[PDB]
Amino acid sequence: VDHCARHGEKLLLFCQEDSKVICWLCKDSQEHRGHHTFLMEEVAQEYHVKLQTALEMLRQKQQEAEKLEADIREEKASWKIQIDYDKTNVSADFEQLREILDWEESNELQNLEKEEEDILKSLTKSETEMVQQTQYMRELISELEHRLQMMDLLQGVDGIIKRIENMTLFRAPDLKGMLDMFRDAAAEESPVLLAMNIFEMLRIDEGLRLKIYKNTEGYYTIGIGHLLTKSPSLNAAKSELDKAIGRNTNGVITKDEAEKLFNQDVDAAVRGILRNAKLKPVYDSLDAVRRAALINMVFQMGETGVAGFTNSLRMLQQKRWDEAAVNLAKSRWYNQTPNRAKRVITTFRTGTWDAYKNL
């Protein structure tokens, strides 16, 4: 049950090298000569602590590894959208080319229908003209024919002698060529749908500011738009900061810390959405480029404040884009921060970072 395998004795020792448990008879052998040993109790309670610490770190890395799972789980599904957009974009693009050809067709055709108007109008004119010149001839033949048959054929004839004596009568360019020119290159750049994130979003929307400033609303705030306190006391806001950073900041911080707060503010907001019953369903419904836009509206005016946009939360889940943009503009949130709301909407609209590529 608990004895040395072979020697049949009590396992008391612990070789440092082998790191395995042995008995005193095991010690006097090949694999344990020159080896330092100890009794199990002399090393036990020390090792116990050593794994009590290994466990804790090993548990954090089990969270970090469970993030890398999610991380690429998102990227897969993201490309699925990236592709199934570049696809429509690429197709619809050609569709417009297929249109400009349809116009240029009937255009060039009516330029030939114009020649069938011009040359055809000089036709019926010089037709009727020389068609009477034919019957007017039968008018004189029938005349003389009955003029003959004396009173008839003489009533002025040396005039008709003078009458008869004066009877005078491709658009097609190398389209393949141009497409071969543009197919070459123009600007080979990174993706245009996941070359940015919720972080770079808010970095642009909130800016990074190291020393305490006042809000859009007037309140004290720091770093990547982290609210400190509604109070007018700069010190009180310094106090909250001092308390928030875990040192004596004095209303100014490192960028490294400015980031920490931001990661937390983001991540804290997210948990606010996962717990709120009205928000989450809309989150899971949207693509990444919009999943971030919800965090933005939450990061700004908090959980309870976004849940109120029920009229807007409906369309976006039903995915009526151009309309959800107009309904959000009627909320006070648009009135107060016009440019910010505009950028977030345009992102709820286009489903792209196009509202940010400027900045």
What burial class does residue 287 get, using C-beta atoms within 10 Å of its C-beta: 0-12 exposed, 13-18 middle, 19+ buried? Answer: middle
Q: Among residues 186 and 277, whose Cβ is nearest to a second copy?
A: 186
Element (H, E) at 37: strand 37-39
Cβ nearer to a second copy, comparing 75 with 267: 75
Stretch that binds Zn ion, among 19-27, 107-115, 239-247, 263-271 (CB under 5 A): 19-27
CB of 103 to a second copy, least distance (A): 9
Span interacting with Zn ion, options 4-12, 183-191, 196-204, 258-266, rule CB under 5 A: 4-12
CB 170 within 8 A of CB 184: no
Positions in 33-72 near Zn ion (CB under 5 A): 35
Contact status, residue 252 vs residue 210, Cβ threshold 8 Å:
yes
Q: What's the CA angle centered on 158, arms 153 and 161, to 5 degrees?
A: 95
Q: Which does 66 bind (CB under 5 to 8 A by kind): Zn ion, a second copy, none?
A: a second copy
Q: Is 18 in the site for Zn ion (CB under 5 A)?
A: yes
Q: Which is nearer to a second copy, 173 or 218 (CB)?
A: 173
The correct pick among 1, 2, 3, 4 for binding Zn ion (CB under 5 A) is 4
Query: Considering CB distances under 5 to 8 angstroms, the limit depending on partner class, which of a second copy, Zn ion, none binds residue 25?
Result: Zn ion
- Interface segment toward Zn ion; rule CB under 5 A; list 25-33, 58-66, 209-217, 222-230: 25-33
Instruction: Give 281's contacts (C-beta < 8 A, 6+ positions apart).
Output: 317
Q: Which residue is nearest to Zn ion (CB)?
A: 26
**Partner whose footprint covers residue 154, from a second copy, Zn ion, none (CB < 5 to 8 Å by kind):** a second copy
Q: Concatenated DSSP letters for 78-107?
A: HHHHHHHHHHHHHHHHHHHHHHHHHHHHHH
Give the integer Cα–Cα distance in Å for 51 and 284: 40
Select from a second copy, Zn ion, none the partner in contact with residue 274, using the beta carbon and a kind-dependent cut-off of 5 to 8 Å. none
The radius of gyration of the chain's CA atoms, rounded to the nearest angstrom, is 46
Task: Compute φ and ψ for 15, nearest 5 degrees.
Answer: -75, 135
Written as six digits, the tokens of 222 are 């720091």
Cβ of residue 37: shortest distance to a second copy, in angstroms? Answer: 12
Q: Which of 10, 13, 14, 32 binds Zn ion (CB under 5 A)?
A: 32
Minimum distance, C-beta of residue 95 to a second copy, in the bound complex (Å): 9
Distance from CA of residue 344 to its chain's centroid?
A: 12
Closest CB to a second copy among 152 and 332?
Answer: 152
Q: Residue 282, exposed/middle/buried by CB under 10 A (0-12, 13-18, 19+)? A: buried
CA-CA distance, 276 to 295, in Å (whole number)?
13
Closer to a second copy by CB, 68 or 359: give it: 68
Q: Which stretch binds Zn ion (CB under 5 A): 7-15, 180-188, 192-200, 335-343?
A: 7-15
Residues at the site binding Zn ion, with contacts judged by CB under 5 A: 4, 7, 15, 17-18, 22-23, 25-26, 32, 35
